[PDB]
Amino acid sequence: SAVMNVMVQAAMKAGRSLVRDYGLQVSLKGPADYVSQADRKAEKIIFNELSKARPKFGFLMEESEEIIGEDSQHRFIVDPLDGTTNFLHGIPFFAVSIALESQGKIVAGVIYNPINDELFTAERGSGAFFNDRRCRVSARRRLEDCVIATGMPHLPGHGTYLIELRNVMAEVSGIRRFGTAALDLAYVAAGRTDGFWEDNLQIWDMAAGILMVREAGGFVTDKEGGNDIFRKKNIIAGNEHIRIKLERALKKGI
Amino acid sequence: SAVMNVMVQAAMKAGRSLVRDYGEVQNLQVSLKGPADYVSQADRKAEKIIFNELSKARPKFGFLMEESEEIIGEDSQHRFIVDPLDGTTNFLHGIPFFAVSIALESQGKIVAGVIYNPINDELFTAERGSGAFFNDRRCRVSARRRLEDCVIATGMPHLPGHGTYLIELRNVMAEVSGIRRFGTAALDLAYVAAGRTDGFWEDNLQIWDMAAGILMVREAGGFVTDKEGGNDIFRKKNIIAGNEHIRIKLERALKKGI
Numbered sequence: 001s002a003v004m005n006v007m008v009q010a011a012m013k014a015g016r017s018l019v020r021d022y023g024l025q026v027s028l029k030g031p032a033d034y035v036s037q038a039d040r041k042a043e044k045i046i047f048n049e050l051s052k053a054r055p056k057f058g059f060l061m062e063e064s065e066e067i068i069g070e071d072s073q074h075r076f077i078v079d080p081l082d083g084t085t086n087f088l089h090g091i092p093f094f095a096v097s098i099a100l101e102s103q104g105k106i107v108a109g110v111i112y113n114p115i116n117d118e119l120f121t122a123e124r125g126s127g128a129f130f131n132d133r134r135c136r137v138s139a140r141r142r143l144e145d146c147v148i149a150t151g152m153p154h155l156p157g158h159g160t161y162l163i164e165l166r167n168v169m170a171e172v173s174g175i176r177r178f179g180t181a182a183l184d185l186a187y188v189a190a191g192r193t194d195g196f197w198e199d200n201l202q203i204w205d206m207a208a209g210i211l212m213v214r215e216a217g218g219f220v221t222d223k224e225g226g227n228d229i230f231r232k233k234n235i236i237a238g239n240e241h242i243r244i245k246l247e248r249a250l251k252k253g254i
Numbered sequence: 255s256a257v258m259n260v261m262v263q264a265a266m267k268a269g270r271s272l273v274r275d276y277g278e279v280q281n282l283q284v285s286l287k288g289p290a291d292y293v294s295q296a297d298r299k300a301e302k303i304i305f306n307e308l309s310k311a312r313p314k315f316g317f318l319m320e321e322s323e324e325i326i327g328e329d330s331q332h333r334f335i336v337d338p339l340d341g342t343t344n345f346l347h348g349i350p351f352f353a354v355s356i357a358l359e360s361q362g363k364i365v366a367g368v369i370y371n372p373i374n375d376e377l378f379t380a381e382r383g384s385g386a387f388f389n390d391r392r393c394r395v396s397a398r399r400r401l402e403d404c405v406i407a408t409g410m411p412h413l414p415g416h417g418t419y420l421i422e423l424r425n426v427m428a429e430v431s432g433i434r435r436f437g438t439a440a441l442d443l444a445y446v447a448a449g450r451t452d453g454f455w456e457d458n459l460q461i462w463d464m465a466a467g468i469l470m471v472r473e474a475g476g477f478v479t480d481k482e483g484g485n486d487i488f489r490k491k492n493i494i495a496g497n498e499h500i501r502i503k504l505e506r507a508l509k510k511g512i
């Protein structure tokens with residue numbers, strides 16, 4: 001669609017800015033929670049580019065106050081830099097994430113890793129794509145064959161998290177913690193990891209990636225197996241078999 | 255030096271092979287060496303390329319290579335130590351964090367190291383006494399002095415020692431701005447050497463996983479110990495790496511409650 005094209009172009013322009021900045025006025029928004037000039041410039045670019053094409057739409061953006069659109073039915077949801085801490089450390093693993101929400105549903109999503117030039121896209125009913133080729137969740141059925149990605153609390157819920165990690169670690173070929181959220185969901189949708197779980201995530205961390213995984217033939221629930229992801233701010237994602245096995249592993253001993 | 259030049263060229267040629275194979279993973283024969291411990295045709299071809307290049311250059315040197323039997327050199331005092339693919343599980347899953355690692359051991363000491371991530375074209379090199387380099391520019395460990403500012407990389411057991419690991423992780427997780435688990439060993443050490451992470455710890459690593467990386471971190475102004483703070487790394491098969499401040503605070507955090 002035209003709107004997907006506009007989203008893709010905004011993400012890639014912001015991504016090129018991030019790549020220039022990668023090769024900065026940092027501040028703390030909260031404990032271990034960073035924002036830099038790179039995030040701010042990416043978000044300006046995305047706001048300006050999307051505005052030129054769909055001036056009627058609303059904007060929910062990580063780094064600035066929400067903008068209400070003239071068209072009450074549509075808003076872009078923007079993470080201008082998923083993996084800020086990675087970026088600031090020179091860890092070449094981070095992404096731009098843009099979703100479109102129409103009448104309370106996520107209908108388009110773009111996640112772009114500009115370091116590796118990896119473009120993940122999905123529209124409601126279109127399937128997931130990686131660099132213009134269809135992609136799907138992995139077909140693994142046993143946890144012992146799987147690599148599972150995770151997000152960790154650092155510097156609330158550490159004890160519960162460590163129970164979950166214990167249960168999953170005992171059963172899988174690998175755990176990964178890359179430091180992103182959107183890109184981790186894209187990696188599940190593209191079959192690069194077999195599943196993902198995390199808590200304390202914002203709407204912009206997850207919106208594009210939830211759609212991606214679902215369009216890729218996978219399943220996404222909150223940590224309780226329900227569909228209250230944005231309110232609960234937690235997630236389990238994977239193919240039908242792995243998602244349920246993860247949900248079971250996560251609850252053992254809780 | 256001549257020998258670093260040869261090592262770099264071997265690593266980069268292997269790296270080119272790996273990038274080629276990375277585009278066609280499903281056509282690679284893959285076997286288990288142990289629970290969750292994979293080797294593929296890509297590892298073996300990388301190793302072939304490295305052996306073919308290095309042995310041409312130094313035919314009397316020994317080779318200690320992950321995927322094949324050790325070759326005792328006719329020169330008893332020198333051997334290459336090779337991990338032809340650091341991050342095999344990542345590689346097989348299409349995850350872009352993996353590296354080739356080559357070190358040179360002379361008279362029991364590691365004297366040169368190359369770690370190359372061919373996806374991102376990241377070349378880390380060091381020779382004993384001469385400092386660490388990242389893509390032809392000097393690099394160095396980070397300047398961070400407090401855990402709360404740090405990102406610490408870790409390696410896990412998966413599919414012995416899980417409980418002890420979870421104590422260590424609990425202790426570090428409570429103190430830092432971030433934990434990372436990338437799925438490599440050599441490349442993690444290179445990231446500490448270049449100041450991209452602030453520290454690293456892991457157990458059950460082999461000589462080829464760490465030889466080049468230990469030199470890298472030391473030449474980058476950092477410090478590397480076993481988990482008890484000594485220098486028995488290859489025997490104990492464990493490691494803590496970081497700048498002087500962070501490595502000691504990690505060692506203390508790892509022992510709390512044990």
Ligand SMILES: [Mg+2]
Pocket residue numbers: 039062079080081082083084
């Ligand atoms: Mg962000």
Ligand SMILES: [Mg+2]
Pocket residue numbers: 202205
């Ligand atoms: Mg956030």
Ligand SMILES: [Mg+2]
Pocket residue numbers: 297320337338339340341342
């Ligand atoms: Mg290997």
